[PDB]
Amino acid sequence: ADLPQYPFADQQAEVCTYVVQSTAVMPTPMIFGPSPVEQLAVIETEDLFE
Amino acid sequence: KPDETLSSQPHPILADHWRLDNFVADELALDPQPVMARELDYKVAQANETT
């Protein structure tokens, strides 16, 4: 449960410094429905469609 | 028969106001619009213009 780090100055310190890098591509059956659109102030203001 | 050609008819563009058309609105127009008298000839009585 307690393995000392004799060669290191601090035994209780976390000697390592890890950097992870993961990339995953996962085909899935989720719907991924549509992307809405913003509203134009000109429409409903100047009555382009009347 | 004589020649069947019109002589009394206002010019569609030059006899009316010069106004800017709204093309977007005209796209959403698929209904029968009225064609009132006074658009076919200038020999129209006062009352018949609105008909």
mmCIF file with all atom_site columns, C-alpha atoms in Angstrom:
data_model
loop_
_atom_site.group_PDB
_atom_site.id
_atom_site.type_symbol
_atom_site.label_atom_id
_atom_site.label_alt_id
_atom_site.label_comp_id
_atom_site.label_asym_id
_atom_site.label_entity_id
_atom_site.label_seq_id
_atom_site.pdbx_PDB_ins_code
_atom_site.Cartn_x
_atom_site.Cartn_y
_atom_site.Cartn_z
_atom_site.occupancy
_atom_site.B_iso_or_equiv
_atom_site.pdbx_formal_charge
_atom_site.auth_seq_id
_atom_site.auth_comp_id
_atom_site.auth_asym_id
_atom_site.auth_atom_id
_atom_site.pdbx_PDB_model_num
ATOM 1   C CA . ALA A 1 1  ? 0.000   0.000  0.000   1.00 0.00 ? 1  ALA A CA 1
ATOM 2   C CA . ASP A 1 2  ? 2.983   2.352  0.507   1.00 0.00 ? 2  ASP A CA 1
ATOM 3   C CA . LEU A 1 3  ? 5.917   2.039  -1.898  1.00 0.00 ? 3  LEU A CA 1
ATOM 4   C CA . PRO A 1 4  ? 8.527   4.710  -1.050  1.00 0.00 ? 4  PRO A CA 1
ATOM 5   C CA . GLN A 1 5  ? 10.404  6.572  -3.782  1.00 0.00 ? 5  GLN A CA 1
ATOM 6   C CA . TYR A 1 6  ? 13.956  6.244  -2.475  1.00 0.00 ? 6  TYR A CA 1
ATOM 7   C CA . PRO A 1 7  ? 15.751  7.875  -5.459  1.00 0.00 ? 7  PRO A CA 1
ATOM 8   C CA . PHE A 1 8  ? 13.412  10.895 -5.354  1.00 0.00 ? 8  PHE A CA 1
ATOM 9   C CA . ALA A 1 9  ? 13.744  13.729 -2.858  1.00 0.00 ? 9  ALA A CA 1
ATOM 10  C CA . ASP A 1 10 ? 10.084  13.478 -1.784  1.00 0.00 ? 10 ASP A CA 1
ATOM 11  C CA . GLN A 1 11 ? 8.745   9.966  -1.225  1.00 0.00 ? 11 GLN A CA 1
ATOM 12  C CA . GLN A 1 12 ? 5.090   11.033 -0.928  1.00 0.00 ? 12 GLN A CA 1
ATOM 13  C CA . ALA A 1 13 ? 5.207   13.179 -4.079  1.00 0.00 ? 13 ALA A CA 1
ATOM 14  C CA . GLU A 1 14 ? 3.714   11.973 -7.357  1.00 0.00 ? 14 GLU A CA 1
ATOM 15  C CA . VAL A 1 15 ? 6.873   11.498 -9.406  1.00 0.00 ? 15 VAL A CA 1
ATOM 16  C CA . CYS A 1 16 ? 5.318   11.041 -12.838 1.00 0.00 ? 16 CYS A CA 1
ATOM 17  C CA . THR A 1 17 ? 3.579   13.662 -14.984 1.00 0.00 ? 17 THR A CA 1
ATOM 18  C CA . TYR A 1 18 ? 1.399   12.019 -17.628 1.00 0.00 ? 18 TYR A CA 1
ATOM 19  C CA . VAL A 1 19 ? -0.251  13.649 -20.639 1.00 0.00 ? 19 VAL A CA 1
ATOM 20  C CA . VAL A 1 20 ? -3.029  11.677 -22.328 1.00 0.00 ? 20 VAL A CA 1
ATOM 21  C CA . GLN A 1 21 ? -4.317  12.060 -25.882 1.00 0.00 ? 21 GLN A CA 1
ATOM 22  C CA . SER A 1 22 ? -7.321  10.043 -27.070 1.00 0.00 ? 22 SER A CA 1
ATOM 23  C CA . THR A 1 23 ? -9.273  10.296 -30.321 1.00 0.00 ? 23 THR A CA 1
ATOM 24  C CA . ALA A 1 24 ? -12.334 8.127  -30.942 1.00 0.00 ? 24 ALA A CA 1
ATOM 25  C CA . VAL A 1 25 ? -14.603 7.710  -33.966 1.00 0.00 ? 25 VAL A CA 1
ATOM 26  C CA . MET A 1 26 ? -17.783 5.812  -33.099 1.00 0.00 ? 26 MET A CA 1
ATOM 27  C CA . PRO A 1 27 ? -20.455 5.119  -35.723 1.00 0.00 ? 27 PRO A CA 1
ATOM 28  C CA . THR A 1 28 ? -23.764 5.277  -33.861 1.00 0.00 ? 28 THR A CA 1
ATOM 29  C CA . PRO A 1 29 ? -27.454 5.002  -34.832 1.00 0.00 ? 29 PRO A CA 1
ATOM 30  C CA . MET A 1 30 ? -28.457 8.253  -33.109 1.00 0.00 ? 30 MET A CA 1
ATOM 31  C CA . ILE A 1 31 ? -30.705 10.490 -35.170 1.00 0.00 ? 31 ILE A CA 1
ATOM 32  C CA . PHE A 1 32 ? -28.610 13.690 -34.995 1.00 0.00 ? 32 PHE A CA 1
ATOM 33  C CA . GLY A 1 33 ? -31.547 15.839 -36.005 1.00 0.00 ? 33 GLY A CA 1
ATOM 34  C CA . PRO A 1 34 ? -31.423 19.148 -37.833 1.00 0.00 ? 34 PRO A CA 1
ATOM 35  C CA . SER A 1 35 ? -29.813 22.537 -37.233 1.00 0.00 ? 35 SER A CA 1
ATOM 36  C CA . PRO A 1 36 ? -32.285 25.447 -36.865 1.00 0.00 ? 36 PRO A CA 1
ATOM 37  C CA . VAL A 1 37 ? -31.793 28.882 -38.406 1.00 0.00 ? 37 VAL A CA 1
ATOM 38  C CA . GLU A 1 38 ? -31.750 32.396 -36.993 1.00 0.00 ? 38 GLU A CA 1
ATOM 39  C CA . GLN A 1 39 ? -34.546 34.927 -37.481 1.00 0.00 ? 39 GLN A CA 1
ATOM 40  C CA . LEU A 1 40 ? -34.203 37.834 -39.912 1.00 0.00 ? 40 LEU A CA 1
ATOM 41  C CA . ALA A 1 41 ? -35.461 41.154 -38.563 1.00 0.00 ? 41 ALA A CA 1
ATOM 42  C CA . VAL A 1 42 ? -36.408 42.324 -42.067 1.00 0.00 ? 42 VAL A CA 1
ATOM 43  C CA . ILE A 1 43 ? -39.059 39.601 -42.274 1.00 0.00 ? 43 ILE A CA 1
ATOM 44  C CA . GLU A 1 44 ? -42.031 40.249 -39.951 1.00 0.00 ? 44 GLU A CA 1
ATOM 45  C CA . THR A 1 45 ? -40.890 43.913 -39.871 1.00 0.00 ? 45 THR A CA 1
ATOM 46  C CA . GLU A 1 46 ? -41.149 45.243 -43.441 1.00 0.00 ? 46 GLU A CA 1
ATOM 47  C CA . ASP A 1 47 ? -43.613 42.506 -44.510 1.00 0.00 ? 47 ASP A CA 1
ATOM 48  C CA . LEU A 1 48 ? -41.638 41.052 -47.403 1.00 0.00 ? 48 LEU A CA 1
ATOM 49  C CA . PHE A 1 49 ? -44.046 38.103 -47.609 1.00 0.00 ? 49 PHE A CA 1
ATOM 50  C CA . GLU A 1 50 ? -47.141 40.205 -46.842 1.00 0.00 ? 50 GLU A CA 1
ATOM 51  C CA . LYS B 2 1  ? -64.967 41.386 -91.526 1.00 0.00 ? 1  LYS B CA 1
ATOM 52  C CA . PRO B 2 2  ? -62.668 44.314 -90.714 1.00 0.00 ? 2  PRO B CA 1
ATOM 53  C CA . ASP B 2 3  ? -59.445 44.144 -88.733 1.00 0.00 ? 3  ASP B CA 1
ATOM 54  C CA . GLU B 2 4  ? -59.918 42.750 -85.216 1.00 0.00 ? 4  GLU B CA 1
ATOM 55  C CA . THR B 2 5  ? -57.336 44.829 -83.362 1.00 0.00 ? 5  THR B CA 1
ATOM 56  C CA . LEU B 2 6  ? -57.773 46.931 -80.243 1.00 0.00 ? 6  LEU B CA 1
ATOM 57  C CA . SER B 2 7  ? -57.352 50.706 -80.274 1.00 0.00 ? 7  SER B CA 1
ATOM 58  C CA . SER B 2 8  ? -58.641 51.866 -76.859 1.00 0.00 ? 8  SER B CA 1
ATOM 59  C CA . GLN B 2 9  ? -56.491 50.331 -74.126 1.00 0.00 ? 9  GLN B CA 1
ATOM 60  C CA . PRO B 2 10 ? -54.246 52.070 -71.563 1.00 0.00 ? 10 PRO B CA 1
ATOM 61  C CA . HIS B 2 11 ? -50.578 51.179 -71.533 1.00 0.00 ? 11 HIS B CA 1
ATOM 62  C CA . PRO B 2 12 ? -50.053 48.765 -68.607 1.00 0.00 ? 12 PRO B CA 1
ATOM 63  C CA . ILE B 2 13 ? -46.886 50.542 -67.417 1.00 0.00 ? 13 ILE B CA 1
ATOM 64  C CA . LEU B 2 14 ? -47.072 54.147 -68.643 1.00 0.00 ? 14 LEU B CA 1
ATOM 65  C CA . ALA B 2 15 ? -50.731 54.628 -67.634 1.00 0.00 ? 15 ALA B CA 1
ATOM 66  C CA . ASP B 2 16 ? -50.117 53.624 -63.990 1.00 0.00 ? 16 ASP B CA 1
ATOM 67  C CA . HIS B 2 17 ? -47.843 54.689 -61.157 1.00 0.00 ? 17 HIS B CA 1
ATOM 68  C CA . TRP B 2 18 ? -44.157 53.784 -61.397 1.00 0.00 ? 18 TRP B CA 1
ATOM 69  C CA . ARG B 2 19 ? -43.728 51.545 -58.347 1.00 0.00 ? 19 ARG B CA 1
ATOM 70  C CA . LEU B 2 20 ? -41.110 49.001 -57.302 1.00 0.00 ? 20 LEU B CA 1
ATOM 71  C CA . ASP B 2 21 ? -42.358 45.417 -57.463 1.00 0.00 ? 21 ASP B CA 1
ATOM 72  C CA . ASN B 2 22 ? -41.909 43.054 -54.508 1.00 0.00 ? 22 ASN B CA 1
ATOM 73  C CA . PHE B 2 23 ? -40.744 39.907 -56.282 1.00 0.00 ? 23 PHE B CA 1
ATOM 74  C CA . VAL B 2 24 ? -40.689 37.837 -53.083 1.00 0.00 ? 24 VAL B CA 1
ATOM 75  C CA . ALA B 2 25 ? -44.324 38.700 -52.361 1.00 0.00 ? 25 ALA B CA 1
ATOM 76  C CA . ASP B 2 26 ? -45.345 38.053 -55.976 1.00 0.00 ? 26 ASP B CA 1
ATOM 77  C CA . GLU B 2 27 ? -43.889 34.541 -55.696 1.00 0.00 ? 27 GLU B CA 1
ATOM 78  C CA . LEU B 2 28 ? -46.471 33.806 -52.978 1.00 0.00 ? 28 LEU B CA 1
ATOM 79  C CA . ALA B 2 29 ? -49.359 34.676 -55.327 1.00 0.00 ? 29 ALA B CA 1
ATOM 80  C CA . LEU B 2 30 ? -51.150 31.725 -56.948 1.00 0.00 ? 30 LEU B CA 1
ATOM 81  C CA . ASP B 2 31 ? -54.745 32.948 -56.597 1.00 0.00 ? 31 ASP B CA 1
ATOM 82  C CA . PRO B 2 32 ? -57.040 34.614 -59.151 1.00 0.00 ? 32 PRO B CA 1
ATOM 83  C CA . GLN B 2 33 ? -56.513 38.356 -58.878 1.00 0.00 ? 33 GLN B CA 1
ATOM 84  C CA . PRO B 2 34 ? -59.220 40.791 -60.023 1.00 0.00 ? 34 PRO B CA 1
ATOM 85  C CA . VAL B 2 35 ? -59.002 42.568 -63.363 1.00 0.00 ? 35 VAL B CA 1
ATOM 86  C CA . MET B 2 36 ? -61.312 45.550 -62.947 1.00 0.00 ? 36 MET B CA 1
ATOM 87  C CA . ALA B 2 37 ? -62.579 47.691 -65.792 1.00 0.00 ? 37 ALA B CA 1
ATOM 88  C CA . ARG B 2 38 ? -60.593 50.816 -66.716 1.00 0.00 ? 38 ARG B CA 1
ATOM 89  C CA . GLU B 2 39 ? -57.680 48.388 -67.301 1.00 0.00 ? 39 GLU B CA 1
ATOM 90  C CA . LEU B 2 40 ? -58.971 47.422 -70.771 1.00 0.00 ? 40 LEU B CA 1
ATOM 91  C CA . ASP B 2 41 ? -60.128 50.692 -72.361 1.00 0.00 ? 41 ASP B CA 1
ATOM 92  C CA . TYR B 2 42 ? -60.475 54.374 -71.516 1.00 0.00 ? 42 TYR B CA 1
ATOM 93  C CA . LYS B 2 43 ? -64.064 54.471 -72.849 1.00 0.00 ? 43 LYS B CA 1
ATOM 94  C CA . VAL B 2 44 ? -65.539 53.534 -69.477 1.00 0.00 ? 44 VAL B CA 1
ATOM 95  C CA . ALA B 2 45 ? -68.358 55.202 -67.569 1.00 0.00 ? 45 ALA B CA 1
ATOM 96  C CA . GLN B 2 46 ? -67.891 56.465 -64.016 1.00 0.00 ? 46 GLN B CA 1
ATOM 97  C CA . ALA B 2 47 ? -69.743 53.562 -62.391 1.00 0.00 ? 47 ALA B CA 1
ATOM 98  C CA . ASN B 2 48 ? -68.207 50.801 -64.524 1.00 0.00 ? 48 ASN B CA 1
ATOM 99  C CA . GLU B 2 49 ? -64.625 51.557 -63.440 1.00 0.00 ? 49 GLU B CA 1
ATOM 100 C CA . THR B 2 50 ? -64.903 49.632 -60.164 1.00 0.00 ? 50 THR B CA 1
ATOM 101 C CA . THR B 2 51 ? -66.759 46.679 -61.700 1.00 0.00 ? 51 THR B CA 1
#
